[model samples]
Target chain A: YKVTISPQLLLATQRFLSREVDVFSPLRMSEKVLLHLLKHPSVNQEVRFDESNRLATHHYLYQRSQPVDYFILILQGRVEVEIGKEGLKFENGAFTYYGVSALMMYCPDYTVRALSDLQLIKVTRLQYLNALMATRA
Target chain B: LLLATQRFLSREVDVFSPLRMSEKVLLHLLKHPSVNQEVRFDESNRLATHHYLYQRSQPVDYFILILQGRVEVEIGKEGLKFENGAFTYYGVSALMYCPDYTVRALSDLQLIKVTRLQYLNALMA
Candidate 1:
């Protein structure tokens, strides 16, 4: 799908973003609109992405705890997720969040910065769909 | 090119969750003392007073998505600014991870910080 954030929103969203989420995907955007949305009520709120891990076995996505809301979709190769020590993998276009995980278990934080120039989406357990809905409505 | 605000967080300290507005507010007030202490890149380092400056490097680390700033980079020689909507890979090798050559705001700005290590773990679900 096409994800577009106003420049205002972009500016605002950037404040809480990290290198992992900095990468972009398909979307027509304006710095102005982004800036406006940046002022949105949810600007710096936490979101999560489930990404690939390099050093550890592909089985374990991350080993520690993350401090924000994020989404880890595989843009290139495949990635895995471990729920209380159970592991699974998802290919490109695959959904990283399998269940209401955030509201469930607190998994460790680990991800593989894909060797490929990944072209994927980054979202948190709560913000992704909501942001899209906010614009859709 | 997109020059990023690189941070080597110690083994501990996740900054992305807990829905506690107060925690986020408090972090904004507390500056990254390690930033000044963190390895700087060069004289290009611009100090931030505006809230906008926080757009680059945020006080909160665990937010699901991080706001990326257009960055210009140099190995302690010059610097580049990532144009809006652009992102570049950064690491200790990128800018030498020097505390000297970092990006600072040119004027006033506003920024928000979110911390949620717990949330990232939740996404594992």
Candidate 2:
């Protein structure tokens, strides 16, 4: 099955995914840039996890106490983020970045849990930083 | 045609528009040597005066890069400032959307400005 999206949405996505433009900006990612990042050999690795299986136990995709490892780009599925007692839900349009602060030497400030099956593009700190440099050039 | 302004101009000109000191793309423009010379600082400001680059609710026009001095960004109630030597670029967030914060110059400032259409043209060119 083919999913169709508008041209304007695609351009906006490209603009958002190019982190060099604005890292702190609250722009949404687009499928075009997501696809580019996924295919870029230097930047990311595609991975998926299933939470829909009958026996799949509920688990934290990331924990506040754990050291930040991979910066996960949520490509598919929903995620819930909890900061102490506060919580927020995110889906497709909100597929921004996670663990960037950690890349900047900050600790993970929240716990993220998979609310459904997740498809993610994971990159190491070095790879993520290198990607940022590439965009500026 | 040669025109006189704050920054002197020479050679062929864009008659439709008069070059202003503020209509430029400083550092980033210089990186692409062939195009930099044609770029100008489209805007200017003096020390101790706040040059409001963009507001949270205003429509974005030009991408601003500081050629000299410092700029302050205030988001909600929190305020942070960055200097010119910091190699910072502003107006991206606002360029992407309306904006999230208000930007003001903290000192004598000169900026390299590029409009959305100009930047898009450069990206493709």
Candidate 3:
């Protein structure tokens, strides 16, 4: 079966990203990262097998000291997070990004759960390493 | 504009205590002969993808500021990644005696660097 991603992904992504306040200056880096990932060839191959997740409230995303395949970008709703053996607590709203370092194979202290009905998009690690970091100097 | 900078470089004018980071600013600082001896400019200054530019806990040698491209820096030990522009520097930990970092190029790169000796000398006033 032939598979392809909707071209509208980038358009809708940029729209929501800008609509959110203070998104860029804090967490954003690498101008080459986003557009390249959105346009990566592997997305056609990967997204077919791996689709976005929609979760109900109180669902566990991870336990602290665990690693993830791709970092989750919360597209909608909220998540409650726990960190450390001491278990630090916090909550975040729509458009929050999680654990790309852990996504790339470094583990750190984090435990997370959906505080409300949630939607998610994944930026895969295998392809992310291959696609990003080869362009621009 | 050009002459104003020329005066500052030649000491005809004073300085911007908080020296700005810019493509031009690096070139301006590169004027000293000792700075040249420390971090000699070369075609090899450009780096490739996944290049490990620095190693954590290693003896600090040079200060590197990227003119362009992205790097994955081990800030959290969790590795925060950033694209370099201004205020992007590392290797100054030499002053502290230890506890440094590792940075891997996430893309091709252009950077300028100065050695530890040049750093202390430049700051001595």
Candidate 4:
């Protein structure tokens, strides 16, 4: 079913959300609405999406428990979410969301950073949450 | 001493039944000193039949757990209804900003509300 987020963003994440869904998540959402959450950021008296942001190689995007600050979705280049030195890498996979799960899970021992010089879009904690619920699944 | 908020939370936590609200998740949220205090709402509230709970294409930031009565839900062509002990939630925009479905009271109701993101904010501190 369609929720009033954005057609373009929903179309972009069709496979990603369905394939990547967590059955245990208390809140279940349609593939399209999930994508809309990823795309919808914040509004009014809070930080907004920073679509023109740039990161130099090796700069950190987030450290542990930073107050659900904002989300970084890389549009170009690569990044990593690692604890200690060993890490997992993410590129512009069209649906590779970072920081959110960790944010939802207490922002753990997670340290996120740019792995290459990059361009990205960022969402505020407020709006990132504003996007999570469309309707009950 | 457990503190004043602890007393309040213990009493208000009745909105949850052990049936579906994730124990680990709820405990994780509640474990946090800030979250324990940050979470808010009555343990139960009465609802009039046919009252809207949520609608497609609107903002939501809560989780609803029904302690009694029924809720009618519709998304796409399928229609679903929930009785007591069923938990229904859409998003704090945890995915999209609006509800993909619509919800309404099907009968006289008793319910609990919790916003998981309240813990998110509390977790920050």
RMSD of each: 18.8, 19.5, 15.7, 18.8
Question: Mind giving the per-residue lDDT tens digits that candidate 1 earns over A1-137?
Answer: 33343444344344333221322211422333333434444332222333354443433333445443454443233433221211111122222222223312344433332332333334454554454444444
lDDT of 4: 0.43
lDDT of 2 by residue, B1-125 (tens): 01122122112112112232123432234344332222222255342223677676787776555555665554321111222322244554322255555666665554555576665554442
DockQ of each: 0.01, 0.01, 0.04, 0.01
Worst 10 residues of 2 chain A by lDDT: A84-93
Among the numbered candidates, top lDDT falls to 3
Candidate 1 local Cα displacement, residue A106, angstroms? 4.8
- Candidate 4 structure quality by residue, lDDT tens digits, A1-137: 32344445445444544464342132554655645555553311112223355443236666655544554555455554433111211222223445444324335345556555544455565554444545443
TM-score per prediction, in order, is: 0.22, 0.36, 0.36, 0.32
- Could you tell me which residue pairs clash in candidate 3? A133-B106
Q: Pick the candidate with the highest DockQ.
A: 3
What does chain B score (TM) in every candidate? 0.23, 0.50, 0.52, 0.46
Number of backbone-clashing residue pairs for each candidate, in the order shown: 87, 11, 1, 19
**TM-score (second chain) of model 3:** 0.52
- In model 1, chain B matches the true chain B with a TM-score of 0.23
Candidate 1 C-alpha RMSD relative to the actual structure: 18.8
Residue B83 CA displacement from its true place in model 2, Å: 32
